[PDB]
Design an enzyme around this catalytic site. Sequence first.
Site, short mmCIF file in Angstrom:
data_model
loop_
_atom_site.label_atom_id
_atom_site.label_comp_id
_atom_site.label_asym_id
_atom_site.label_seq_id
_atom_site.Cartn_x
_atom_site.Cartn_y
_atom_site.Cartn_z
N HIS A 293 -3.98 6.10 -11.90
CA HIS A 293 -4.77 6.82 -10.89
C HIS A 293 -5.59 7.85 -11.66
CE1 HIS A 293 -2.20 5.12 -7.65
NE2 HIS A 293 -1.27 5.20 -8.61
N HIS B 161 -8.00 -1.29 -6.17
CA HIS B 161 -7.55 0.12 -6.00
C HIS B 161 -7.15 0.75 -7.33
CE1 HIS B 161 -3.30 -1.33 -5.67
NE2 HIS B 161 -3.86 -2.29 -4.95
N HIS C 250 1.58 5.04 -13.91
CA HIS C 250 2.78 4.58 -13.20
C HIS C 250 3.30 3.29 -13.82
CE1 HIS C 250 1.48 6.97 -9.43
NE2 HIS C 250 2.11 7.73 -10.34
N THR D 212 2.82 5.13 -3.45
CA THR D 212 1.71 6.03 -3.11
C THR D 212 0.49 5.29 -2.57
OG1 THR D 212 0.66 6.04 -5.23
CG2 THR D 212 2.46 7.64 -4.88
N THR D 213 0.53 3.97 -2.47
CA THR D 213 -0.51 3.20 -1.75
C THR D 213 0.18 2.44 -0.63
OG1 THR D 213 -0.55 1.04 -2.82
CG2 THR D 213 -1.70 2.80 -3.96
N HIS E 189 -0.03 0.77 -13.96
CA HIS E 189 -1.40 1.03 -13.50
C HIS E 189 -1.66 2.53 -13.58
CE1 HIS E 189 1.13 1.62 -9.96
NE2 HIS E 189 0.26 2.62 -9.72
N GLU F 168 -1.65 12.13 -9.04
CA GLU F 168 -1.05 12.07 -7.69
C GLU F 168 -0.04 13.19 -7.57
OE1 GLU F 168 -0.18 7.82 -6.95
OE2 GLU F 168 -2.06 8.05 -5.80
C1 LIG Z 1 4.73 -6.30 -5.91
C2 LIG Z 1 5.43 -5.30 -4.96
C3 LIG Z 1 5.92 -5.86 -3.57
C4 LIG Z 1 5.07 -5.29 -2.58
O1 LIG Z 1 5.27 -5.38 -1.36
C5 LIG Z 1 3.90 -4.68 -3.20
C6 LIG Z 1 2.84 -5.80 -3.39
C7 LIG Z 1 3.29 -3.52 -2.51
C8 LIG Z 1 2.18 -2.89 -3.36
C9 LIG Z 1 2.76 -2.41 -4.76
C10 LIG Z 1 3.55 -3.55 -5.48
C11 LIG Z 1 4.31 -2.99 -6.68
C12 LIG Z 1 3.28 -2.42 -7.72
C13 LIG Z 1 2.39 -1.31 -7.09
C14 LIG Z 1 3.18 0.00 -6.83
C15 LIG Z 1 2.25 1.04 -6.23
O2 LIG Z 1 3.03 2.23 -5.93
S1 LIG Z 1 2.92 3.46 -6.88
N1 LIG Z 1 1.36 3.92 -6.90
O3 LIG Z 1 3.75 4.40 -6.18
O4 LIG Z 1 3.40 3.03 -8.23
C16 LIG Z 1 1.67 0.55 -4.94
C17 LIG Z 1 0.83 -0.74 -5.17
C18 LIG Z 1 1.68 -1.85 -5.78
C19 LIG Z 1 0.63 -2.95 -6.15
C20 LIG Z 1 4.56 -4.14 -4.49
ZN LIG Z 2 0.57 4.32 -8.68
#
Ligand SMILES: C[C@@H]1CC(=O)[C@@]2(C)CC[C@H]3[C@@H](CC[C@@H]4C[C@H](OS(N)(=O)=O)CC[C@@]43C)[C@H]12
Ligand SMILES: [Zn+2]
Length: 257
Positions: A93, A61, A116, A195-196, A91, A103
């Site tokens: 977008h 993504h 972000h 946001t995901t 990361h 976003e």
């Molecule tokens: C590692 C943590 C714990 C958890 O449950 C995870 C895996 C959910 C998905 C998260 C990740 C933290 C880093 C990222 C933040 C992103 O959000 S954003 N786009 O608003 O910055 C959503 C995608 C993302 C990979 C989280």
């Molecule tokens: Zn993001």
Amino acid sequence: HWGYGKHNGPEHWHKDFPIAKGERQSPVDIDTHTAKYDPSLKPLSVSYDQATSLRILNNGHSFQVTFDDSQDKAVLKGGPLDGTYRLLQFHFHWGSLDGQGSEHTVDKKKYAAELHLVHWNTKYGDVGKAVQQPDGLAVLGIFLKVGSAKPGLQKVVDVLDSIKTEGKSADFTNFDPRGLLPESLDYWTYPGSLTTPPLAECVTWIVLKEPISVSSEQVLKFRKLNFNGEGEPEELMVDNWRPAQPLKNRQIKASFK
Ligand SMILES: C[C@@H]1CC(=O)[C@@]2(C)CC[C@H]3[C@@H](CC[C@@H]4C[C@H](OS(N)(=O)=O)CC[C@@]43C)[C@H]12
Ligand SMILES: [Zn+2]
């Protein structure tokens, strides 16, 4: 299963993640004339001198650079925040063309991309616990516009050919995220969400007013990434942004007059 396409994109996410229609979803449009200057807001403290980057990954993504968050080495404090937030990853977008990709929007303006930097509150001990808390994460959002090259981004752009498809990673040590920051730390802040998926309502958003400039050649390299895994039909990783969500009962605060 979820993605950014017609059949699995943002308008579908609520089926697996009903919080998608919740009271503090991100991103939002930042109405600059309605955002309240808050003289009580502190300057943001960005302490990245001891940052330890580890890996760069195509997660299907976005692409992400992951950091050692096993100690307070790269931390965000101050601003709207109580306590210390460790940098886990950054990361981006971005769009298929320069007129979309961000976003957050500013008076409905879309930027070419959005960076972000994701941080988690050390009082919850690990990021998995932090995403279950309304003050668990702080995401520093930085807009990208297309113009002059960002020299501090080039090390990232030059390894993207090695992580073209979902699941590919590479060594990415000694990357300094200070090279991605604009001059000003003037910001807007509001309570929101990832946001995901899973769209957890755990984020204090800190969105910098000043964009960074990147070159057309740098953003072109983002757009050569693939959503698909190796072997699978090639679908360019473009337009991996969630559109603005309803502000509902929230106030956006400005750190600046
Ligand atoms: C590692 C943590 C714990 C958890 O449950 C995870 C895996 C959910 C998905 C998260 C990740 C933290 C880093 C990222 C933040 C992103 O959000 S954003 N786009 O608003 O910055 C959503 C995608 C993302 C990979 C989280
Ligand atoms: Zn993001």
